[PDB]
Amino acid sequence: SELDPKGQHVCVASSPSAELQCCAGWRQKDQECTIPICEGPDACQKDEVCVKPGLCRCKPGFFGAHCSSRCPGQYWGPDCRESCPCHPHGQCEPATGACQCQADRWGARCEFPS
Amino acid sequence: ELDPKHVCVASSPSAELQCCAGWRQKDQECTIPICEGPDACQKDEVCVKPGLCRCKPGFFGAHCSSRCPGQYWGPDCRESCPCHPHGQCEPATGACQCQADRWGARCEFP
């Protein structure tokens, strides 16, 4: 896939080819450069994920000093940084946020019974 | 005023001292991280590392309103409390408050 010049963290090589490349600290996904890079002395430890160039946080759905505590149900994402909108009638997939309703609930936020 | 002890030296010919990128002085050294612009810290967050905000000590979660469980202290619960469950740790410093008739740095003695 090729890079969108209007995409996130896309830069231009100042080499004479002047072709599109990810800006420093980012890697390409599809048409933009939205994968942060954590390498060298800032490489992410076990049970951590890279969230910003050179910055790691506990993996999605976990928090704590060893990234081993499970987020309570009202949160998702790394370090529980995201709010789960279907709590308490469901819980959110830790990495995507997608709602998993309890047994007899439905709706985008699990707001409806039966 | 500035101690050459996160202190850097300017690229200019003045060869004067300055805080290294991302840090500010509060006294004689530069140990205040900088959180600015789009990386400014929200309510109940603190800047801990340049361009990084975390929930204030003893709290975590999307609105930094959940209190850490007892085995942790510090911002976003990043620190381990060595005296849990025989004591509790001060959220910002970690200092143990041992339970009744317990002692030691980690409340390890009955």
Author numbering:
A (entry chain B): 20 to 133
B (entry chain A): 21 to 25, 28 to 132
What do the authors say?
SCARF1 (scavenger receptor class F member 1, SREC-1 or SR-F1) is a type I transmembrane protein that recognizes multiple endogenous and exogenous ligands such as modified low-density lipoproteins (LDLs) and is important for maintaining homeostasis and immunity.
The crystal of f1 fragment belongs to space group P212121 with two molecules per asymmetric unit. The f1 crystal structure contains a number of loops and two stranded β-sheets stabilized by hydrogen bonds and disulfide bonds, which is consistent with the typical feature of EGF-like domains, and it adopts a bow-like conformation with the middle part (~55–102aa) protruding outward. The electron density of the N-terminal end (~21–62aa) of one molecule in an asymmetric unit is relatively weak and some residues are missing, probably due to the flexibility of this region. In the crystal of f1 fragment, two molecules in an asymmetric unit are related by a twofold non-crystallographic symmetry axis. At the dimeric interfaces of f1 and f2 fragments, hydrogen bonds are formed between S88 and Y94 of the monomers, and F82 and Y94 are also close to each other, thus may form π-π interaction. Two salt bridges are also observed in f1 crystals between two monomers, one is between D61 and K71, the other is between R76 and D98.
